[PDB]
Amino acid sequence: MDIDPYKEFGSSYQLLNFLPLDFFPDLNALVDTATALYEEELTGREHCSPHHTAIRQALVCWDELTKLIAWMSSNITSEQVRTIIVNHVNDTWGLKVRQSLWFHLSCLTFGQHTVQEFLVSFGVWIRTPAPYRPPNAPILS
Amino acid sequence: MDIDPYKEFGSSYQLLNFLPLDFFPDLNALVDTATALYEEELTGREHCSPHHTAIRQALVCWDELTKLIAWMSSNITSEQVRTIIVNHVNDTWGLKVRQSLWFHLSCLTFGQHTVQEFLVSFGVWIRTPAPYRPPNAPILS
Amino acid sequence: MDIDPYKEFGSSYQLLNFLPLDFFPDLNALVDTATALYEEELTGREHCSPHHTAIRQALVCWDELTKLIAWMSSNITSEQVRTIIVNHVNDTWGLKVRQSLWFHLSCLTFGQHTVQEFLVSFGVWIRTPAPYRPPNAPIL
Amino acid sequence: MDIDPYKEFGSSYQLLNFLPLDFFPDLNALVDTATALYEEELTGREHCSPHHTAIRQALVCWDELTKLIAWMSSNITSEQVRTIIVNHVNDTWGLKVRQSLWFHLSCLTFGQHTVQEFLVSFGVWIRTPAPYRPPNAPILS
Amino acid sequence: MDIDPYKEFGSSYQLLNFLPLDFFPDLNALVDTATALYEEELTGREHCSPHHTAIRQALVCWDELTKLIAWMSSNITSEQVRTIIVNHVNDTWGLKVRQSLWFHLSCLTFGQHTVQEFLVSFGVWIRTPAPYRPPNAPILS
Amino acid sequence: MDIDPYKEFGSSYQLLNFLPLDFFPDLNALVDTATALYEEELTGREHCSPHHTAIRQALVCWDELTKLIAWMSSNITSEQVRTIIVNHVNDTWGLKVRQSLWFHLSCLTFGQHTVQEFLVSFGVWIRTPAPYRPPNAPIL
């Protein structure tokens, strides 16, 4: 079916649809961020809050995606077909991963309630036109 | 008569007359904002605080306005008359809708008391001349 | 998404669609109706029951259309160009206003529990044809 | 200032003008009604309920107008000139007198609150279209 | 004599002499600001905190000033003399009014203690040279 | 909007308009009046009763006009140009000041309850013509 992976977390696609598609950080820095904090936590045994659980599936989504890119480049795809696929998966797959990892790692670093206020207040910022808008877009703290 | 739709909400036209006519967000992002948060709340049964009620009339004002634009464009108006009407209703009708939806959706996301301080403090910002004024115009949080 | 303006109030727009055009009083009656009756109630400071509030939203919504027809008549429109626009917006837009004005005024005068049983019984009257209904419609 | 006298009477000046203007009876019949009912109270010493008092003021108001109409008619004014004025003062002042005298004579003969409910019921009756209506106009008991 | 109108309010001319003469808002927006909030409060009966009282004399100072400008322009002054007077009163009279109204309307919107910290901290900002100074000059909140 | 400077104080500007020009003492008296009487009261630090405060506003308002007439005399104005401006602003602007200075000083000397009954009774004196009033106006 068509479930929302943020539905139990008090969010949706529509809350993330406040965010533009260029706000998100790139993957490797987000990869290194959870590596900096939560490597023993994600590889541990503790069943701690299911934001932990969602990252575990998220990296597995990313890890076999890297082998998938490494497979089709090394074996099958010619150079014209390959660059169209690599551009497409970075704009479709990893974008959802950038939807995924950015969400939960914010919540492990700030809690759930900080995230919920963050998405709405940024939406107020992005709905404001170019005049009458502060150049400080709101961020985390 | 000539009632003020913010009179019970501790506000008026004059409090919104602090705000310039270009501060307001555009409609669709404001439409998607309440869609992101309050779609089940506005379509529900709960009689919760009449800021809920005001949005319900506000979208009905917007929804038949879209059919009105779709009617007269498809049927009656020639191209010279049509663009004058579309420009006029966006500057008169939806401007009041941008007065409407921006008010209450701020209150559902921040409370009444946050809104009241916000309108006055922005007025202090806009009455300040171009020197001696911070480029951070005040926003919500 | 769509918003039913009667959804939380124990009603529906589809319930309101069993009302013919001849049932509703016109606009200038209902403007005067809220004028003489609830003048202190609409201008009041208070968080009164939301049937007040929908009326408070509807009138401000209505006054834009008075501004609209006075604008384009003097500014752009010809006779027959204005004629089809004004008559259609009278019969589609303001009819919904004539629905909503008629609704909440009776809810503030008789309570919405009385309103529902009125409209259902008027339904069952108008759900039947004329040779199988009393010739006087339900009132009160 | 421009006061409305009905405000202390548990009513308003807008309640008077909600009725159709033909409804207010002819004034010569209105004078005789208070004569047939209230001649002892309108001439007595008594401070009785101040809807008594306004009746006294209106008849003092009305007679000097009738003296004024009898003044300029017999003395100075040309006949097509006076006819515009005499028509106007009946349509303007006497209508207010018909607003005045009908309100209080209903109030003394039927109570304060019953007249208030009478304005609502007869008012919403005539605003209602002819089908889907109570078949006869409401009147007093 | 030479009293200070802020002496009872814990301030002076010297505290306002921290503020440059261009920081102040223009009159009409300040006029509309108190109109937006305090129109029933200033025209009421309540003897509430004498910051209320000071605005009442301040607008009377402004109101007969407008009639004074409207008098001498319409009657007496030729065009060369008039523009020198209008420039002079805007830089002397209304500047004191901009000293006046900006002070109290800040206090009705933020309290006394917020104002006192505001004047000193802005003085620290304005005494700081052009390097080593944040472009966010401090404002109200 | 307009602000009545006597509105909260149980008075009105329309009440003050029953006072002729000859009733009020002039400016330099009332400047000296607040000088000798309430010198510590006007220069004081305290949140004294707002009849102090209106006097505290009025004098600072007044001192701009002394700055104004000393400015344009030496700077721009001719004789008859200055003559009509100064005399009119003496009789329209400062008369309102001569109203307000006379008002709050008596309120600090006798209390505003005494002030109202003084002004009403002086009204009823001046509301009647001279052949139907005592030839001495009310005092105290």
UniProtKB/Swiss-Prot annotation, chains A, B, D, E:
GO cellular component, as recorded: extracellular region; host cell; host cell cytoplasm; host cell nucleus; T=4 icosahedral viral capsid
GO annotation terms (biological process): microtubule-dependent intracellular transport of viral material towards nucleus; symbiont entry into host cell; viral penetration into host nucleus
Subcellular location: Secreted; Host nucleus
Alphabetic keyword roster: Disulfide bond, Host nucleus, Host-virus interaction, Repeat, Secreted, Signal, Viral immunoevasion
Keyword Oxidoreductase: no
MF term (GO), any: DNA binding
Chief location bin: secreted
PTM entry text: Phosphorylated. Cleaved by host furin.
Family: Belongs to the orthohepadnavirus precore antigen family.
Quaternary structure and partners: Homodimerizes.
Function: May regulate immune response to the intracellular capsid in acting as a T-cell tolerogen, by having an immunoregulatory effect which prevents destruction of infected cells by cytotoxic T-cells. This immune regulation may predispose to chronicity during perinatal infections and prevent severe liver injury during adult infections.
Record protein name field: External core antigen
Organism for this UniProt entry: Woodchuck hepatitis B virus (isolate 59) (WHV)
Residues of the full protein shown: 31 to 171 of 218
